[PDB]
């Protein structure tokens, strides 16, 4: 039993502070009420980070290696059935 | 302005507030280093989860007995509450750290808290350790001294809201105790 | 070049990383056989989709109660977050290629990932195996030795990049055994 402190209808609900920053003149800050969602695993894979693996994407073409390129990125991932 | 994001607060609602330019000039004129403050929370919301997990993570591996059997920390569903309870008190510590003002997090969430603590079993030393863990992580990324990752600020000192956020977690423990 | 890679993986913002002729001449400086290195990682990315399928469906076929009701590739759900887990697993390992060093790897993907699947009910022994048959793939493109697929390279010998992957790919196994 909780329900003095925190009663259900309110029970794990804490405030979020969002930034629109880009060093531009439409910049703002913004604050929301929100429920707390999270999982088990997350001890190791934080939500910032989870699902997100090296991309890795090498342009080359025979004898044009002054027109060679490699990019790296980080994005979230659906392997394709 | 403050009292417009505690308003949001008073009512719980969920429906999102927002201030820009002469609002947001309001805010940084009424709120002391405004333009340094909203970068030291900038800099713990933008690591907020990583911070939580890693700390949560940080309580377990220096006491597993929390995920043995009978532990607080034992089964899934343990254990996706207590990494939720982390997310709660720094949210209510980035928007203390946002108002330059404790009350919200001392009205709104450590309020009642040692006892509901106590009535559910969860252990109150280790919870200190979380918290001393995230007040750790708060002051590296706000001074930019952090080892595992830089963050660009332009050049000055920021050693009071430093020890600004050092007090809020130390608030955490204090309530528990 | 070095440095923006790194801040990449550092920040995990999902934004890419891009580079000149001179930038890629500092990157090759650094790297050891950079040229046979770049077209180790080229022979993989270039068949990354068709090595987690074919992995994975290599692993059901040797296992078919992994598609039978209970189980843990049972419901599209969860056969596509198999296939999510396949190539990310198969991305770490190449970003170790080209960095020539294992700790990314150890460090983002394979630390607490026993741990995880222990506690979701994935099942390791599997997992070992779809690791295992994208580890002979990959050895596979790195040598051109591939049964139904040729790609283009210039003459010579690649056998210690080969090597180098079956080294990266033995450490997944080892994380989760
Ligand atoms: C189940 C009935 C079952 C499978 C499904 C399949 C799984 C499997 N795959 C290999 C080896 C390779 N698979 C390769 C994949 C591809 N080759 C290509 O040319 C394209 C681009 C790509 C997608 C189709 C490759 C390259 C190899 C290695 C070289 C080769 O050509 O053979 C294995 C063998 C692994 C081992 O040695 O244990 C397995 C098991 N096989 C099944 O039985
Ligand atoms: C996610 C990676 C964040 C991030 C987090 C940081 N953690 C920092 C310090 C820190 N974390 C722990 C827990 C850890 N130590 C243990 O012994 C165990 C179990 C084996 C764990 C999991 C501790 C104890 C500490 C040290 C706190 C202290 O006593 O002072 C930290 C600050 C490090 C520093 O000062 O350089 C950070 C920022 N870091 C990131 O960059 C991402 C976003
Ligand atoms: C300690 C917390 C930090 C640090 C902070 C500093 N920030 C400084 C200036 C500055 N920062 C911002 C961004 C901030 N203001 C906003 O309005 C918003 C969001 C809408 C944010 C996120 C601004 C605009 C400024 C003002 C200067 C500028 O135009 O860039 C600053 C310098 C203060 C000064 O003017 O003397 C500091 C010290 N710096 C540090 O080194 C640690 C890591
Ligand atoms: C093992 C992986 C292969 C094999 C590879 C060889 N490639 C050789 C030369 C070579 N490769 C590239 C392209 C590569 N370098 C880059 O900078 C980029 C993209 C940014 C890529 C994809 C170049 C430019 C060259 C130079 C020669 C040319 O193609 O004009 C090579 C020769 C030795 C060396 O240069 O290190 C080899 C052995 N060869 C094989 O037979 C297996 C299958
Ligand atoms: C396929 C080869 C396996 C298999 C895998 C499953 N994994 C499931 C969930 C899951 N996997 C991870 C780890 C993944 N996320 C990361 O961030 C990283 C590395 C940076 C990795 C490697 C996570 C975190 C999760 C849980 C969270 C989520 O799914 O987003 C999963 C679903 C479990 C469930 O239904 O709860 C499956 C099926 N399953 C198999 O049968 C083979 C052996
Ligand atoms: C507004 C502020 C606010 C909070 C601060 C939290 C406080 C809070 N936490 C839990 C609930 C819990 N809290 C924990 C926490 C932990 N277990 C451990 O072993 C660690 C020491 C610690 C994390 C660091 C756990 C594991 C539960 C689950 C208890 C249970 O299921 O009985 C609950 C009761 C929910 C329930 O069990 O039904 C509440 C009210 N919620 C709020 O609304």
Redesign the interface.
């Known amino acids: ?2 329900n ?3 009663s259900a209808d ?1 029970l ?10 880009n060093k531009t003149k ?24 989870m ?8 342009s ?1 073409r ?1 004898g044009a290696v ?1 027109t ?14 | 302005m403050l009292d417009a994001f505690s308003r949001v607060v008073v009512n719980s609602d969920a429906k999102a507030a927002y201030v820009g330019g002469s609002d947001l000039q309001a805010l940084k004129s009424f709120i002391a280093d405004g333009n340094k403050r909203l970068d030291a929370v900038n800099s713990i919301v933008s690591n907020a989860s990583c911070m939580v997990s890693d700390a949560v993570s940080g309580m377990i591996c220096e006491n597993p007995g929390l995920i043995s059997p009978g532990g607080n920390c034992y089964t899934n569903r343990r254990m996706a509450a207590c990494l939720r309870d982390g997310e709660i008190i720094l949210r209510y510590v980035s928007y203390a750290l946002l108002a330059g003002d404790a009350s919200v997090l001392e009205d709104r969430c450590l309020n009642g808290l040692k006892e509901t603590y106590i009535a559910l079993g969860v252990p109150t030393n280790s919870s200190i350790r979380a918290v001393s863990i995230m007040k750790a992580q708060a002051v590296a990324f706000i001074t930019n001294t952090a080892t595992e990752r830089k963050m660009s600020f332009a050049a000055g000192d920021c050693t009071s809201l430093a020890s600004e956020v050092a007090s809020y977690f130390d608030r955490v423990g204090a309530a528990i105790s």
Request: hydrophobic fraction near 30%.
């Open positions: 039993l909780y003095k402190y925190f309110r794990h609900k804490a405030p979020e502070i969002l930034f629109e920053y439409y910049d703002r800050v913004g604050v929301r009420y929100t429920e707390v969602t999270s999982k088990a695993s997350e001890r190791f894979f934080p939500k910032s980070r699902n997100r693996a090296p991309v890795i994407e090498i080359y025979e002054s060679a390129s490699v990019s790296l990125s980080m994005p979230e991932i659906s392997g394709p059935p």
